[PDB]
């Protein structure tokens, strides 16, 4: 089994202060709702990606499904800000989060899993139909469902997701229904 | 065992639906409640059911009967809980000094 | 009135040791008890704190005396 990435959240400093009204009026697919939130929400189409551009020149880019695709979408957002007229430098690009999900191909019985690992797992059925297991060494949060689908979130690199899944796989096989 | 694991599954997964208690409380207030009220009020009522059934199985174990719960063990369950003040009635103005 | 807690309450009695197949009359007694408890708590909550509004704070003051119920409310709110 391999976990495929579904969501990459990155951040990039453009270095130049922006007034948001000209970007909202000139650029396409740009949404600005200040009485609601203080950023410009511009979406692109080729890579299905969304950017929140802030007035201090910092940009949050989310939605892509690899590191190179997120970097390429961030470059596209920087050049569409640039060609409007602002002098925009690609100062620092950092990926805040990487999210991956996988299916372990059997039903899982969560009550023994909270019974034997109650130090790291918080499980309350009523609200969330899932078990939050916190891995202490990778620093990942895993939502483990009864149907067999596991969601790994809270990672910076890919190898952390891979090591967390290889860590939590023998426990899940030990607790098969 | 194989029944204790099924019983522990029903002890945790069972709940009153939030779509009906929010309909039930709002018929008493008149206007509106919040989601964190319905989350708590659906949780206290599961403890209160577990206050009765765990004590109605003490009535049945005290008498000479089996696990199926007749209403004899359930009217006696509300009687013993009310004598310890567990069942609140806001229509009986009580008086301790006589 | 119909029964709004007929199938849900049968899972809960099995959760506390009754049977897989409880009696309909026992399920009916439990449903009536739950409705009465919810109504009493809602009236006291409307009286205490903000008049005419039932809030989590009012519910917590009302359940403060009973340890089992207070612990469950706190745990559910923190987990949420």
């Amino acid at each position: 089994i391999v976990p495929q990435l579904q969501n990459i959240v990155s951040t990039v400093n453009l270095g130049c202060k922006l007034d948001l009204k000209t970007i909202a009026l000139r650029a396409r697919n740009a949404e600005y709702n200040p009485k609601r939130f203080a950023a410009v929400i511009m979406r692109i189409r080729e890579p299905r990606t969304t950017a929140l551009i802030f007035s201090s020149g910092k940009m949050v880019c989310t939605g892509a499904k690899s590191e190179e695709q997120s970097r390429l979408a961030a470059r596209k957002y920087a050049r569409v800000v640039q060609k409007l007229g602002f002098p925009a430098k690609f100062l620092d690009f950092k990926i805040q989060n990487m999210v991956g999900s996988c299916d372990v191909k059997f039903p899982i019985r969560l009550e023994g899993l909270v019974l034997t690992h109650q130090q790291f797992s918080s499980y309350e059925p009523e609200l969330f139909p899932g078990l939050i297991y916190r891995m202490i060494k990778p620093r990942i949060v895993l939502l483990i469902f009864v149907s067999g689908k596991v969601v790994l979130t809270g990672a910076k690199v890919r190898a952390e997701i891979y090591e967390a899944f290889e860590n939590i796989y023998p426990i899940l096989k030990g607790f098969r229904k | 065992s194989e029944e204790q694991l099924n019983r522990y599954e029903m002890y945790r997964r069972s709940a009153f639906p939030k779509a009906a208690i929010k309909r039930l409380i709002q018929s008493i207030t008149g206007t509106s409640v919040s989601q964190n009220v319905v989350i708590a009020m659906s949780g206290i009522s599961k403890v209160f059911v577990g206050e009765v059934v765990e004590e109605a199985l003490d009535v049945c174990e005290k008498w000479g009967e089996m696990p199926p719960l007749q209403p004899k063990h359930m009217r006696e369950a509300v009687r013993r809980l009310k004598s310890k003040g567990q069942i609140p009635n806001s229509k009986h103005k009580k008086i301790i000094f006589f | 009135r119909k029964r709004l807690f007929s199938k849900e309450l049968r899972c809960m009695m099995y959760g506390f040791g009754d049977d897989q197949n409880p009696y309909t009359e026992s399920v009916d007694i439990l449903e009536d008890l739950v409705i009465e408890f919810i109504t009493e708590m809602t009236h006291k909550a409307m009286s205490i704190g903000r008049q005419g509004r039932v809030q989590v704070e009012d519910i917590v003051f009302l359940i403060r005396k009973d340890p089992r119920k207070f612990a469950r409310v706190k745990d559910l709110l923190t987990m949420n």
Partner: peptide
């Protein structure tokens, strides 16, 4: 969310009883 409750109608309460 509805799969935690769908199994709560297949296992428990198969036959309906009554009592005198």
């Amino acid at each position: 969310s509805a799969r935690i409750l769908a199994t709560n109608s297949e296992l428990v309460g198969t036959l309906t009883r009554s009592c005198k």
